[PDB]
Amino acid sequence: MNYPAEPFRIKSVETVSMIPRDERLKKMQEAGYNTFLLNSKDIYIDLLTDSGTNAMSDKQWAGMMMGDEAFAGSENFYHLERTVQELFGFKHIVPTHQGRGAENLLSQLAIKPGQYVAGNMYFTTTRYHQEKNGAVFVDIVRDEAHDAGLNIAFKGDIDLKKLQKLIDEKGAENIAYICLAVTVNLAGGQPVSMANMRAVRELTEAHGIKVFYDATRCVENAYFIKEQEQGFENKSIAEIVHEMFSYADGCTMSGKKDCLVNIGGFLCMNDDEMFSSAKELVVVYEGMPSYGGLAGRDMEAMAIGLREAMQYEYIEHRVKQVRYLGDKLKAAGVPIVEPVGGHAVFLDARRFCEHLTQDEFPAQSLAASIYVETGVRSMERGIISAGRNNVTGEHHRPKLETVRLTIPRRVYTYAHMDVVADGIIKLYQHKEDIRGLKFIYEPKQLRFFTARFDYI
Amino acid sequence: MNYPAEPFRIKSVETVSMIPRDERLKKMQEAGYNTFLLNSKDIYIDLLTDSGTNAMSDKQWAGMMMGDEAFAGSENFYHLERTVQELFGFKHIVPTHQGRGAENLLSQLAIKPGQYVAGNMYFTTTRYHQEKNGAVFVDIVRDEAHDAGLNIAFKGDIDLKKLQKLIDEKGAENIAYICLAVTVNLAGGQPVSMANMRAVRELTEAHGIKVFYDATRCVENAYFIKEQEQGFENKSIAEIVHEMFSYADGCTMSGKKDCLVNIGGFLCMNDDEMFSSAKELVVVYEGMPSYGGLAGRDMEAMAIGLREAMQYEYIEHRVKQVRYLGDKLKAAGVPIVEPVGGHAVFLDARRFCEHLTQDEFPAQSLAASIYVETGVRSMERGIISAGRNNVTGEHHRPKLETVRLTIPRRVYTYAHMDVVADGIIKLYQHKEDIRGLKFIYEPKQLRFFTARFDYI
Amino acid sequence: MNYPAEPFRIKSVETVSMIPRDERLKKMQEAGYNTFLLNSKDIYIDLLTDSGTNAMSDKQWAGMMMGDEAFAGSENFYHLERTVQELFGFKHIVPTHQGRGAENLLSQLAIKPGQYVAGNMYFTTTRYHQEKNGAVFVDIVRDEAHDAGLNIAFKGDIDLKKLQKLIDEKGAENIAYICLAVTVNLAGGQPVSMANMRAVRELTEAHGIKVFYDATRCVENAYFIKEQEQGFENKSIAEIVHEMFSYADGCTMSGKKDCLVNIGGFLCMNDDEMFSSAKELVVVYEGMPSYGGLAGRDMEAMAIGLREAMQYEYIEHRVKQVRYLGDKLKAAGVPIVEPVGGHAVFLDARRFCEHLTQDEFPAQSLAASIYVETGVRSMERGIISAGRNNVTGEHHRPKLETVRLTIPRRVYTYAHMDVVADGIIKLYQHKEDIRGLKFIYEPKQLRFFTARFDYI
Amino acid sequence: MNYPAEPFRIKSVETVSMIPRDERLKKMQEAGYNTFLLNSKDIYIDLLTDSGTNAMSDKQWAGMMMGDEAFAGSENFYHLERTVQELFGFKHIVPTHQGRGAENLLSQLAIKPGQYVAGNMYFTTTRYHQEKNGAVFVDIVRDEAHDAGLNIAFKGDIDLKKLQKLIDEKGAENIAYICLAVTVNLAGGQPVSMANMRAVRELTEAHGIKVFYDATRCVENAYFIKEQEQGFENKSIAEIVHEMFSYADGCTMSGKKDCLVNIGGFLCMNDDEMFSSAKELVVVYEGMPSYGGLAGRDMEAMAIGLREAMQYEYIEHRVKQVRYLGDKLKAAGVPIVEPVGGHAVFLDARRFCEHLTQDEFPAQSLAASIYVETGVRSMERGIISAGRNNVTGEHHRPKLETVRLTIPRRVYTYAHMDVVADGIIKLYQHKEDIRGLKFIYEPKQLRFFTARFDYI
Ligand SMILES: CC1=C(O)/C(=C\N=C(/Cc2ccc(O)c(F)c2)C(=O)O)C(COP(=O)(O)O)=CN1
Ligand SMILES: CC1=C(O)/C(=C\N=C(/Cc2ccc(O)c(F)c2)C(=O)O)C(COP(=O)(O)O)=CN1
Ligand SMILES: CC1=C(O)/C(=C\N=C(/Cc2ccc(O)c(F)c2)C(=O)O)C(COP(=O)(O)O)=CN1
Ligand SMILES: CC1=C(O)/C(=C\N=C(/Cc2ccc(O)c(F)c2)C(=O)O)C(COP(=O)(O)O)=CN1
Ligand SMILES: [K+]
Ligand SMILES: [K+]
Ligand SMILES: [K+]
Ligand SMILES: [K+]
């Protein structure tokens, strides 16, 4: 069915409300035109991010009451460890408080200064941890991924030709690892095919190169494979997920996404020495290998949530609800990234605001504008997020200048999607009303989080 | 909006199975085609009743952690007490575990054997307690309420002329009280007007007669007054609620309906001496005046929920959600009781299954078909629920042969309403295929709960 | 060991505090010298009752998050039903919101007007439901049970000679049933031996008389059997519990005691017809046979709690903590009921206040006095509770005029017990300071709950 | 009181197994006689650490249901913010997932390579982050702190003469900051006086040097000031806390200690520019300025818990409970570090097991014996935790060969303290029977976590 109903009931609710346009206007100014700086109670439907904003189930809340809070040997850790071993198939697990905790560990463990890390497009925290540790990032995604309007399947795939080139021009020993993300967040939540995962494994293995996945949205990815990759139609999400990771040497994971929790993450690997070193390091930044900066109750919620994510009807509905928002927007002629990805609809800021150049930050501006007319919060995913080149000092110039309508799992309904789509269509009517922005405060890294702007 | 979006978002979800049609058919058979005998774990959308099946808020769940479990003098009781005094404007309140507990107390307190209790139709528990305490029931609802097709506003209103007639024929002193229900469940959830409540108060007061309300769905009732009664456009739900009860000497309430909880109710009154007698009685059946057979956490959740029920956007959506399901069914020509009430849609199974005789249990069979085709549980409200005649062994044969689609508050979405509507509308496009049922097991009493059937 | 440590850890806490003596004095006056009328937040350690005041475990709180709130077919009901079948061994179960709900059902089901019900001492609600339904109560406990200071084992036992006499003088057909309580609350929480249960079964069976247990404190009872009855020392609590009920035709149960919950109860029986009739009746007073006036989450907590009660270390500690309070009091010469029972220490009001007669209510007075000097709340269990004879109109005159220090399960520590014992010993120092009381308001039944007094 | 009763009662309990000695011996062996390798489910009383193992209140659990899970601008953050501003009096606050996260930020913000950080002894994570950022550590604690038997008040005080010496020898500009810990964990949980904090503030301020506090057990510290520092008799815990931090430029805190939570911490500072830099850094390691790697519910629980920690009766009992265990051990002649600290009792295993050499791991073996005999887990803080020398392969051989009995807040009773004390005192009456241990598995790093032993 095109748009299935929620494969669950509502157990408990929280109120939503909208403050007037004029109140929202004061608010957008006081946040320095950065949606990141608005306050939760001032937001009606909050599509800033699907990170940590998911609704847990009654089963997970039951596990929340059974937190075994021991510093060492918590039953919750054993339950997480066993679940991840079973479902992802890696030998070892190190819990971390969230994803960038596990990225800090991997980057410190796996990178020698001056080595290359090659990935299917960059992510902000991931790239920063690679570069802080002295790696050079190389984008090996296909060119097509960078074209917003181009509707092709598995836009997340690595270009094997580009991978071959890197191996030829630099030498295998100078490549720390391949970073393969599932889905690809900045491409619009685009999936990677199993075929691509296999071919990447085969080539890297022949040269002795390691492959570490970013598992953050691996279930959404597995959904796309089931739906769209020939041969996978009668496979279960869990089977698909276990095969995906069989082509990897380990993974980083933010549980705050596809594990259906509000906090939590982990690092997995197969290598014993790397496991031993990872435990030496987790102690510095996170906590004991037996809790990694998480309460026992959160290891428990995350163990239960990751297994709930395997239910076909859950993930089908998750992905199709996002698709519904995109379909409504597209039917009205609103320009979006296509095809719609697993977790968000990305409005194409370049087309929405054809009158601005990327230098007056159309994407930051539109996000503000949607808040002002709508009370819906959305996120900048363009030139601001891309940050500065640390060799030249200029803005990285992404081809994708996008505004992200990001959907938390199990929180909103199709009627909420309708409210969002209506507000956005009206704003489209007068797209030309959206003004250029300029920096008034710029952080030294990850600048999009707390940067502040003024109109040009 | 004809249909506003949910004025809340989802905090937590309730896991459901999603079993396919073929398994649902096995479950229905194991249940002897009686939806009352289905296991909850086997049902996707459970529309058996809106009683005690509501989703609580995060604030209510917070209060669930603050239960003061004292047997006497719990802080949660004082919170419940002042909330009800504030919102309903009654002087005194006695908590009960649910509605029929309050009804038990009222009927023992307020009836002398042989006296009459007149009301706008009746509900089974309410009327049961009236009769077992010696009252004669007299229906004083307007005749229009008995016409299930008549699309008229405030169909729950008492006919003042019938009340006048009762006064003149039996004498004021032989009338124990008037029992005014808001809304009227038996008529399909039909609201009573403020004008009618005032007229009833004025006539009864001149004769010294008491009026007690069944407040169970008073908040749905208040929404209808707000939406449709000239002059109440500028009034809040709370103002309407407080005015409604100013025309009463007291009430009984099942909190499991409009107080947005899973258990709880209470008895209110203004008379000091009745309050005293009520407290003497509550200890025999329920508990102390300050717990009434409720945990402290539940008095707290009900205090919080009743106040949440006053929010305009909440009750508006609650009622418009039910209306959406009714509207969609009606647009497809599916026969329903009209107008659609505050809490449920009733299918006219006599008309739906015209090819079957009432002796083939059309409503019981339609309810079975609906579950098989959709995973939706509904309640038979026809000849089966009517029971078998005490003395002759004939069926009691009611005019209403209906299936009730009863909607718990804040549990389902419009997409779930589409599951229900689409399934029923498909069944209706080939209704003649629906098969008659026969008893294979019939208990001597409460046959609707445990009887088993097979297809003719 | 004499005084074992708690066989659990503290998971969560609530603050306790004490308001000054003068504030307590105003308070005791405004409650009309009835501890029942004080407010929970004005009480420092609340020993009014062990009914519904117990601390639940983390496992039960986990079940509280998994309430299946369906009106029919709740998984929680199936879990309760199965647990009670397994542990108590009765065929059928009907949930009720609490104990007196199940007593209302049994008394209506099993008593013909003018029949006798014979019991091992009376309880207030139990006796009232017997008499409301037209039974005459006969006390068949041994004489020894009525002597407070007499330290003998299994003071709860029925006098078989007294039972034989009743059978001889009235005829078996005029005895509705034998009511056998475990433990015996008003005797001081006194256990009944297995031998006595067997002999009672054997004699009643030969005459065709039914035996229904009051199961409210059956686990405490089972503890005493394990500890003190020869042959039972190597049996498990669960084994002992299952044998106890094998000598009964059914039971009433307040779950609010030994099932470790804050609300809940049930009625059990073996007879099919009586089960069928009980379901007809529960619908009138409580709710459906599938929930009996309980939320699904409470059926779940009660199923889990009853099974936790079977843990030997739990019940051993439960009973020995009470014994510790009694041992400290006795070592200081404070007069108590002996031996100390399962749930409470009962101060002997007659000996504490030798200067008053029972007619100036020493027990009500002392309870007030302990509150005033201590902030510890305790309960009257003497002449006030015993009520009036409904043939003569005079006070029932119990030989046991007692003040109950009642211990909620898993809430307090030995240090709390020490605070209680110290305060009470000091009050003993000046026992003569405690004044006579007289009624100023007397309820028509169960008068102790909300009766109000003034000093003579 | 020498030992007050608990100023709370139990709301809920945590289930524990209660396995007998013979099974405990098997568990210890399966754990290779290393208590760090025990499963939590196998332990009765877990005194491994007071970090993150505290029992929350009912109010905290209520706040756990009110988590506003927004990625930015959560209401729970603003609550945490204003609570810390109010209670600590720092201008700015950045949340972190726990203490070492705050330490990571501080040391990156406040240290230039080659600079000195001087402090009253150190803690391992704290000093680690100082060194890895280029600092040289200098101990400026009073010499008395190094004498574990010396029974002296405020043993945590900095020696102003050592600080003066450092200033004159290295120059103020080469001192990054002074790190003042309250209490001092390494000295046995020894408190610092207000006089010392003021003297340190005055000297450092004259030279332009910053002072940052490790606030982890500041509330235990404040209790000692209240109890023992002349002039603080009339001051509340809150007044003492606020005055303490007025002598600092900021702090790092592990909320998992004195904020009564299971996870959480924060970084405070007064300097506007450092606050700005801190927010730029927090996003790399932890999360947004308004969540810092914490769920919203946890910022809420920590806001509520920190305020609960200010209650006099609570902290008084917390500290006197630890003191009770120390007093009892000392009265029996069991050798301990003196005076007993705010959070733990340390057994002198060198003296306890005089018959063993440090090479036979007396503390590791005593910790094993304690578990076997009582079901109590303790932490080795001796030669094993000291590690093996980087370059020579010799053991690092510490002066302190101790077993730490670390007490989580609000989890245990005096009866549990008796289990611990009685078990240790019995072991001590035949200490010579305690056997030396030898390595059977030794990892290359963090050997205390995973090493395995057998008896010599
Ligand atoms: C594919 C991947 C992610 O999407 C991701 C996080 N995602 C966020 C939160 C956030 C992160 C970076 C931003 O520029 C951003 F604006 C928002 C998000 O909204 O998308 C992390 C890191 O996981 P942590 O957030 O648990 O540390 C690793 N890998
Ligand atoms: C207007 C009114 C009610 O609707 C009502 C209950 N209503 C139910 C539950 C129900 C009750 C009895 C049945 O045979 C039945 F088949 C359905 C329902 O589905 O509609 C009560 C009684 O409130 P209690 O249920 O809290 O005691 C009082 N007044
Ligand atoms: C052996 C037995 C009980 O002890 C009992 C209750 N006990 C109470 C509460 C209460 C009851 C009667 C009083 O006079 C009294 F002052 C207090 C108590 O404190 O002891 C019930 C009834 O169970 P319900 O309370 O769940 O309905 C049945 N049987
Ligand atoms: C005075 C201070 C602490 O005591 C402390 C922690 N303390 C622990 C846990 C622990 C930590 C590391 C170990 O190798 C260890 F064996 C024990 C403890 O048991 O005492 C931290 C760090 O706070 P985080 O743990 O929230 O990051 C900062 N400052
Ligand atoms: K923890
Ligand atoms: K209670
Ligand atoms: K319910
Ligand atoms: K979150």
How many alpha carbons lie under 13 Å from residue D130 in its C-beta half-sphere? 23
Closest-CA residue to A344 (of A215, A184, A229): A184
Closest-CA residue to A244 (of A262, A272, A222): A222
Q: Exposed e or buried b for every residue in C55-77, given b needs 16+ CB within 10 A?
A: bbbbbbbbbbbbbbbbbbbbbbb
CA distance D135 to D166: 14
- In B, which residues are within 8 Å of C446 by CB distance? 280, 283-284
Backbone angles phi, psi at C195, to 5 degrees: -50, -45
Closest-CA residue to A355 (of A278, A436, A417): A436
Tell me whether A61 touches chain C (CB under 8 Å).
Answer: yes
CA distance B200 to A374: 47
For residue D424, the distance in angstroms to the closest alpha carbon of chain A comes to 22
Which helix (DSSP H) or strand (DSSP E) does residue B128 occupy? Answer: helix B124-132
* Ligand 4 atom closest to D265 (CA): 26
CA A74 to ligand 5 centroid distance, Å: 9
Helix (H, G, I), strand (E, B) or coil at A250: strand
Do A1-57+311-455 and A58-310 agree at the fold level? no
Domain ranges of chain D: 1-57+311-455, 58-310
Token pair recorded at residue C22: 């003068």
CB–CB of A336/A330 below 8 Å? yes
Resolution (A): 2.0
Token pair recorded at residue A397: 């110039």
Closest-CA residue to C407 (of C310, C325, C338, C330): C325
Taking the CA atoms of chain C, what radius of gyration do you get in angstroms? Answer: 21
Closest-CA residue to D138 (of D161, D163, D160, D111): D163
Q: Which fold has domain D1-57+311-455?
A: Aspartate Aminotransferase, domain 1 (3.90.1150)
CB–CB of C246/B278 below 8 Å? no
Nearest C-alpha in A relative to C60: A65
- In C, which residues are within 8 Å of B69 by CB distance? 52-53, 262
Pairing of strands D344-348, D402-406: antiparallel
CB–CB of C45/C412 below 8 Å? yes
D265 lines ligand 4 (CB under 6 A): yes
Helix (H, G, I), strand (E, B) or coil at B279: helix
CB–CB of D219/D316 below 8 Å? no
CA distance D23 to A240: 43
Closest-CA residue to C93 (of C311, C294, C243): C294
Residue in this structure with the two tokens 């492959």, named with its chain if needed: A211
Tell me whether D70 touches chain B (CB under 8 Å).
Answer: no
CA distance A181 to A429: 36
Tell me whether A43 touches chain D (CB under 8 Å).
Answer: yes
| Angle at alpha carbon of residue B11, lines to B10 and B13, rounded to 5° | 75
Which of B51, B97, B260 has the most ligand 2 atoms within 8 A of CB, as the residue to mutate? B51
For residue D280, the distance in angstroms to the closest alpha carbon of chain A comes to 6
Helix (H, G, I), strand (E, B) or coil at D8: strand
Q: What is the DSSP string of B404-443?
A: EEE--TTS--HHHHHHHHHHHHHHHHTGGGPPPEEEEE--
- In C, which residues are within 8 Å of D10 by CB distance? 10, 12-13, 55, 410-413
Taking the CA atoms of chain B, what radius of gyration do you get in angstroms? Answer: 22
Closest-CA residue to A434 (of A333, A362, A374, A329): A362
CA distance D159 to D141: 5
CB–CB of D261/D221 below 8 Å? no
Beta carbons within 8 Å of C102's beta carbon, 6+ residues apart: C94, C96, C252, C253, C254, C265, C266, C267
Amino acid, res. A267? L
Closest-CA residue to A87 (of A304, A313, A343, A409): A304
Q: What is the DSSP string of D91-110?
A: SEEEEESSHHHHHHHHHHHH
| Angle at alpha carbon of residue D139, lines to D138 and D143, rounded to 5° | 150
Which other chains touch chain A, taking contact as 3+ CB pairs less than 8 Å apart? B, C, D
Looking at chain C, the residues that come just before a C–N gap of over 2.5 A are none
CA distance A331 to A334: 8
- This entry's atomic model was obtained through X-ray
CB–CB of A59/C66 below 8 Å? yes
CB–CB of C357/C381 below 8 Å? no
Pairing of strands B437-441, D210-214: unpaired
Classify residue B183 as left (phi > 0), alpha (psi -120 to 50) or beta.
beta
Whether omega before C125 lies within 30 degrees of 0, making that bond cis, reads no
Distances (CA, A) of D312 to C278, D7, D11, D219: 55, 10, 20, 10
CA distance B118 to B164: 11
Tell me whether residue D429 is exposed, middle or buried, using C-beta atoms within 10 angstroms of its C-beta: 0 to 12, 13 to 18, 19 or more: exposed
Whether residue C73 and residue B293 make contact (CB cut-off 8 A), yes or no, is: no
Backbone angles phi, psi at A213, to 5 degrees: -85, 150
Whether omega before C191 lies within 30 degrees of 0, making that bond cis, reads no
Pairing of strands B265-269, B250-254: antiparallel
Closest-CA residue to A192 (of A153, A143, A246, A151): A153
Pairing of strands B136-139, A92-96: unpaired
Q: How many CB atoms lie within 10 A of CB B87?
A: 20
CA distance A51 to A54: 7
Q: Tell me, what DSSP letter sits at residue B141?
A: B
Closest-CA residue to D96 (of D259, D255, D265): D265
Closest-CA residue to D10 (of A337, C234, A74, C8): C8
Closest-CA residue to D340 (of D155, D182, D193): D155
Which helix (DSSP H) or strand (DSSP E) does residue B64 occupy? Answer: helix B58-64
Q: What is the DSSP string of D291-331?
A: TTT--HHHHHHHHHHHHHHT-HHHHHHHHHHHHHHHHHHHH
For residue D309, the distance in angstroms to the closest alpha carbon of chain C comes to 12
Q: Which residues hold their Cβ within 5 A of ligand 5, which is an ion? A: A 69, 295; D 52, 262
C98 lines ligand 3 (CB under 6 A): yes
Nearest C-alpha in D relative to B12: D65
- In B, which residues are within 8 Å of D55 by CB distance? none
Closest-CA residue to A304 (of A58, A100, A13): A58
CA B261 to ligand 7 centroid distance, Å: 8
CA distance B406 to B412: 11
Q: Tell me, what DSSP letter sits at residue D173?
A: G
CA distance A45 to A35: 13
Beta carbons within 8 Å of D29's beta carbon, 6+ residues apart: none
C385 lines ligand 3 (CB under 6 A): yes
Whether residue B66 and residue D62 make contact (CB cut-off 8 A), yes or no, is: yes
D 125-184 → A contacts, CB under 8 A: 125, 128-129, 132
Whether omega before A20 lies within 30 degrees of 0, making that bond cis, reads no
Closest-CA residue to D210 (of D168, D240, D180): D180
CB–CB of C312/C232 below 8 Å? no
Tell me the H-state helices in B310-386.
312-331, 349-352, 362-374, 383-386
For residue C64, the distance in angstroms to the closest alpha carbon of chain D comes to 13
Q: In what order do the strands lie in the sheet with D8-15?
A: C56-57, D8-15, C8-15, D56-57
CB–CB of D81/D288 below 8 Å? no
Q: What's the CATH code, domain D58-310?
A: 3.40.640.10
Whether residue A65 and residue C64 make contact (CB cut-off 8 A), yes or no, is: yes
- In B, which residues are within 8 Å of D64 by CB distance? 65
CB–CB of A112/A137 below 8 Å? no
Token pair recorded at residue C255: 């779950």
CA distance B159 to B142: 5
CA distance A306 to A295: 17
CA B52 to ligand 7 centroid distance, Å: 4
